[PDB]
Amino acid sequence: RVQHFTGYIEDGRGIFYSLPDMKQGDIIYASMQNTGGNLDPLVGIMAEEIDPAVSLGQVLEKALASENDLISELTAVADRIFLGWDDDGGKGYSASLEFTIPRDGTYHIFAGSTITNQRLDKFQP
Amino acid sequence: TYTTGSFQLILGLNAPQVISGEGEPEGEVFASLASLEIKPEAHVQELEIRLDKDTRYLTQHTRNLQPGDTFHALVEPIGEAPLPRLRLTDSGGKPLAFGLIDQPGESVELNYTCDQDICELVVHVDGTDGQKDSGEAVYRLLVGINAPNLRESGQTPVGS
Numbered sequence: 001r002v003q004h005f006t007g008y009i010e011d012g013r014g015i016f017y018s019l020p021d022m023k024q025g026d027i028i029y030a031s032m033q034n035t036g037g038n039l040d041p042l043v044g045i046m047a048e049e050i051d052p053a054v055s056l057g058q059v060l061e062k063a064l065a066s067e068n069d070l071i072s073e074l075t076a077v078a079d080r081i082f083l084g085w086d087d088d089g090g091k092g093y094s095a096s097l098e099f100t101i102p103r104d105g106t107y108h109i110f111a112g113s114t115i116t117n118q119r120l121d122k123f124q125p
Numbered sequence: 126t127y128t129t130g131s132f133q134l135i136l137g138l139n140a141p142q143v144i145s146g147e148g149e150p151e152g153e154v155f156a157s158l159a160s161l162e163i164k165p166e167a168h169v170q171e172l173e174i175r176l177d178k179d180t181r182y183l184t185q186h187t188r189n190l191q192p193g194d195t196f197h198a199l200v201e202p203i204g205e206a207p208l209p210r211l212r213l214t215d216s217g218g219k220p221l222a223f224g225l226i227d228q229p230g231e232s233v234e235l236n237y238t239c240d241q242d243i244c245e246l247v248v249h250v251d252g253t254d255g256q257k258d259s260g261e262a263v264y265r266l267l268v269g270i271n272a273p274n275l276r277e278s279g280q281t282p283v284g285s
Binding site: 067068069070071088093116117118119120121122123 | 182184212214217218219220223225247249251253
């Protein structure tokens, strides 16, 4: 049971996908790859649909100084927002996630872009 | 002299077609790498670097790391130069580690371990905290592979 999607991400604006009426014991598989631009994929899953932009903005605003100023902050926020997520699992910067459905219910699949650095002269997430 | 380069190895068990050099893999495996059972030797390199007014950012590239290896680094200024920032990124810039300031705040250290099959690492040293023209600040950089005693090496740079 495999489905395909294609979309476009603009300035870190995510896209939601709904998986209605899954049953207990079901295992979900996901893979997201870059087909154009500088996109770095990020995949997350959650029970109730809520915009992750507000919290990820706080992650972006703390670009001054911290212990593991980016990676630890992003991991903490992601572990709280999503029940499962994956940043880099495939070949390169592509994502690959496996998640088993705990109970009976409907869930949502979130696709978007992570916070990365693409410069060697200075650091700018 | 000896020779260097890449090679392809074909090993067979009771398959006399291997010696023809066209033996396609078959069956269940019978051999594995010997290095995966244990740990190798240490390699240490020390370099002197200077951050000029227009050269406040510097990057270096490291050789390929096998899975399971460890990486260590530390920076110590020659004199009264302020402590710069230290971080570790791959060849594409993805951050992997950040430098920690020790309680005797005169050096910054870093540590990392290898998970992927091949890892290429880049070490960033930058003192662009502001726009001050401090002048001729010079620091000592010590790096090592599978060398956790970098704090007190004692031996001269060994290995490679």
